[PDB]
């Protein structure tokens, strides 16, 4: 299934307090009214950040797995949260292909070379991104298909890990005795701050022509008139490189076909001039035992120009 | 193909519908309602065959309006048609008249600003301050250019209001042949001393060197000039502007003023009650129209936007590695820091010089307006003019000044004929 | 200097309320006008001389 | 101003000097012009009692030009710009209304 | 279009150009401010009427022949013979020209309304309702306004009309 | 400029073109503001 977001995935772009100031910011957000996949599991791509919402009073989501290979022989991130608190950890793991008395934690079976440790209905939103080796998490837990409203998310962690991520999975608590996945794109918003310094509203500056007018004017109320907001630029397609033909193919055809060659001690010497050239007959000749080219590569013998051959 | 893109909106307080004009783009190369105009392709509005008054101007005779729950395009109408029943022995002569009162608003002065060049460019930095010595006398030019136009701003307000030698007062018995002037005369029970109408006019409207200087004349001082002009024209007519103020009763002043436009004086004296009733209602309508002033708000907004832009140019690199002078020099190499700081100085100096050039160009516009306002003060308030349309629409009788925050508002009283009949 | 924030001005008790992750505030036009003391966790305004 | 103050007589207030414009004479100055403005200024006013019209034979009489003044015991017609009284006659006035 | 002039659609230059701040916003505001006043300047010179006045089908007037300044339906855009003579004598990278709001036809409508108003009602329509008066009498009032008596017009009506038509 | 220079060397040459072309375009617009005041003054005389 797929659903329609409304105004979700807006987080505080940075520190810096602020008052009544319609501030304009450019960053990685979840676009407003976007197409978010729905899951009720398989390895998903990363590509640039992730939006992750969910709904449920109990706690079905039992951590995430991130990284490039999601396997051993290389380090990865693992985030779990038991009934105590969140545990960030970065080791080399060996993950079960299906990870999940009251005994638990059958997720991995190896934790080598740990480079980071840490210990300590309802809507639980997260924003994940990974920039310059920093893995950021924003979150907020607000009590009540998702509803409709606006709520800005605050920083949770600051993790100087260094980890690369291209794919991730999720972890669920099974029965033995619902979540969303969006992605972030570079967009521009106009953010409205209240006197307490919180974000109360936003405008997506890449949606309906009216929003582009609001963003250019730095307002949420536009007065009647006509406004120049942007520009139209037709784009070119295809790249055609035209050129001459040949004519004086400058006949290699005899120096490689001379019926009477010359003994080595008195070797012949033919100098090409400003004529046509086409080495495609040499490289593609088909019959050859040794062909080694030292100055330039054998294929770039046409993308160059020399004086005396 | 390239071109601008404009957004046509009825206002967010009316609807959220919108139409888009692609300027000089053919309607086959854009990627419902598509309308081709000589100004480009209009999409999202329907074109009708009727003709309305222009609301939102599109161009080349085409306008848009929000009338026919949607958005439409149309060729604006210039006005209603009227054929005049001309013949060679027919005349139309009025049998009645109305008194009309209209307003006119003019900016007189603007905000006096100065910028300290050293705090803008360097900002408490000794390495930069010494480098300013290698550019010569640029700051000398900057201070004189802004000061030379700041002095004129006080001159502009003296020439409009200080056109009377004495401070005239009205008698306590505020009652003039039946005319009620209490909305234009000072009301002894208000902030400072404004008329009830001036209260609408005033109620409706240290960073890093960027300093704002106060005007020489305060708003209380301008109110006192305008109340003296009002007292003179009601008690003394137009005599105080050519010598000593000479008293004459007001009913007799109005009779002279009718004579000056071609109306005999008996027409006033036998209808005195009607003209006083019409005047008193016409003045009372002014407060409804005020409760307009865009000619004054534009001056404040244009200068505020220039001051904000000047500050924002302090975050440009202008081809340096950092915008902060305490950064470059600290982490780099002095020989290189000097060249990069000189790039910041040059870029910021060019911004500041652009600011000054635009203030001189804008100062000429305010002076041109203030010269017109001074001319109207003498020719509309201190006398009766025959210049067509110069002192309001209709046959000029009289004018009363009102003060505004950075300008002056004239109340023009004109005579307009009505109810014509046919004669041979 | 507040852990990197370099400036000049008079420090006074403020009446702003930061969020529990924010160090300093800026005004409109993006200039720092308040900071939080790292040690005492109090917000101070930074007017100019 | 050269056209309107020197080549003619203007009624524009304060355009050709202070007072009632009579005439002007130009003088040449370096990079400029100097105007010598000749004006009419009234002086030495007296106060009088006035009335808009006069009744005679049950009819209202209005002045053709001027104002009615009273010196205390008798009424006269004067021109508005210079005190010069004449007796009120049927050739000085016109009749309109009752 | 600031970017198209300075860089000309090149991503390396246009990204470096961003380092100079907002000069390209100032350029647009300056040009917009003077491009809007061009229609305001024209609007305030010609839109001095509320109604669009038309002349009568007959055209005797009094001897005057204003046919050289009044519209001619047989000419392009219904201009006058003199308005036609006047219009008979007098693309790239990021540069465009905006059309005026008032077309030439609309300007001809303003001038024909002023011309139809004055020939039939004189100056009365500029102070109120248009009041008709015969043209010959309008000229006599105009002489009175300059200190000439009325009989000088009425006894020389053909002479004044002949001098006007020839001029 | 983008074909016979490495990126650290081509940036310097692009800034020279931006500065020159920006200066010329900014001069163009200033001169139009100065002429625009004159046509407006003429239009006010024509309206009068
Ligand atoms: C030397 O000459 C021979 C024959 O004259 C060339 O052989 C030709 O090779 C091309 C490519 O395979 C064939 O399509 C032709 O049919 C061949 N010629 C004949 C007559 O069959 C050979 O290419 C020449 N040497 C070089 C270096 O070009
Ligand atoms: C004023 O115009 C009217 C027409 O509108 C003139 O009446 C015409 O007079 C001529 C003779 O001059 C007759 O031949 C026509 O038959 C009349 N027309 C009508 C409809 O009766 C009138 O003569 C004009 N006045 C002057 C002084 O020229
Ligand atoms: C001239 O016109 C005015 C209206 O503009 C007339 O005055 C109005 O007359 C009506 C009818 O008697 C009254 O109900 C209104 O109250 C009057 N208005 C005012 C402001 O007094 C006036 O009667 C007309 N004069 C003539 C001679 O017809
Ligand atoms: C002149 O008009 C003013 C209003 O602009 C009149 O003042 C009002 O008078 C009535 C009757 O006393 C009161 O109910 C209002 O409250 C008054 N308004 C204000 C603002 O005080 C005034 O009476 C008029 N003067 C004459 C002589 O008629
Ligand atoms: C004076 O008389 C003329 C006719 O000579 C009147 O003209 C009328 O105008 C209206 C439009 O306003 C037309 O619909 C009528 O057909 C005209 N009538 C005639 C008989 O042609 C004109 O209205 C009169 N003026 C006044 C002030 O009453
Ligand atoms: C940093 O350390 C200081 C002590 O050096 C802490 O100051 C204490 O603050 C609390 C209130 O928050 C007071 O009740 C204590 O009495 C203070 N201690 C002293 C010795 O003055 C300060 O709270 C610490 N900051 C943080 C963020 O933990
Ligand atoms: C005309 O009479 C008025 C009084 O009705 C004179 O004004 C008075 O002038 C005296 C002398 O300057 C003052 O002391 C009084 O206060 C004035 N009275 C008022 C009510 O203002 C005026 O001076 C007389 N004009 C002439 C030429 O004598
Ligand atoms: C007002 O002026 C008249 C006229 O000068 C004075 O009245 C007298 O009028 C008779 C003729 O009816 C003359 O013979 C007298 O010579 C006049 N007397 C004077 C003194 O001029 C009248 O006196 C004047 N009134 C006042 C109050 O001065
Ligand atoms: C108005 O006057 C013009 C002349 O100024 C008349 O037009 C010309 O008339 C002569 C004959 O007298 C012709 O030979 C020309 O060809 C005419 N010119 C044009 C352009 O047509 C015109 O006929 C007069 N109008 C009226 C109604 O009498
Ligand atoms: C999201 O896009 C997919 C195609 O990538 C489409 O099948 C799906 O219907 C879309 N979802 C919505 C809510 O439009
Ligand atoms: C919670 O999980 C962490 C990580 O596995 C572990 O170190 C910690 O002991 C757990 N707490 C309890 C009470 O089991
Ligand atoms: C990581 O662990 C492997 C053994 O699994 C070891 O050989 C290697 O030295 C470790 N790397 C570091 C940086 O400790
Ligand atoms: C992440 O992968 C990129 C290649 O996609 C590589 O160039 C980069 O060095 C990696 N980052 C880290 C921190 O290993
Ligand atoms: C938060 O803002 C509300 C208004 O939205 C205000 O009433 C309240 O006092 C603020 N809270 C604080 C702690 O300043
Ligand atoms: C603007 O909105 C207000 C309510 O906020 C309303 O009273 C007013 O009529 C609206 N104006 C228009 C033109 O719709
Ligand atoms: C757009 O192009 C078509 C031909 O493809 C042409 O017929 C039409 O006139 C063009 N429109 C304009 C406004 O030039
Ligand atoms: C407008 O009228 C023309 C004829 O003059 C007609 O062809 C056209 O269809 C009409 N337009 C509409 C929208 O009805």
Residue numbers in the entry:
A (entry chain A): 27 to 66, 81 to 140, 153 to 172, 187 to 210, 215 to 247, 264 to 395
B (entry chain A): 591 to 621, 640 to 676, 690 to 826, 854 to 939, 944 to 1076
C (entry chain C): 542 to 590
D (entry chain C): 1028 to 1125
E (entry chain B): 737 to 826, 854 to 930
F (entry chain B): 980 to 1027
Please share excerpts from the published article on this structure:
Additionally, the BA.3 sublineage is at a low prevalence for the time being but continues to spread. Additionally, BA.3 has combined mutations from BA.1 and BA.2. BA.3-SA represents a mixture, with 81.7% selected particles in all “up” states and the rest in the two “up” and one “down” conformation. Consistent with previous studies, only the “up” RBDs are bound to ACE2-PD. As BA.3-SA represents a mixture of the BA.1-SA and BA.2/5-SA conformations, in what follows we will mainly focus on BA.2-SA and BA.5-SA for analysis.
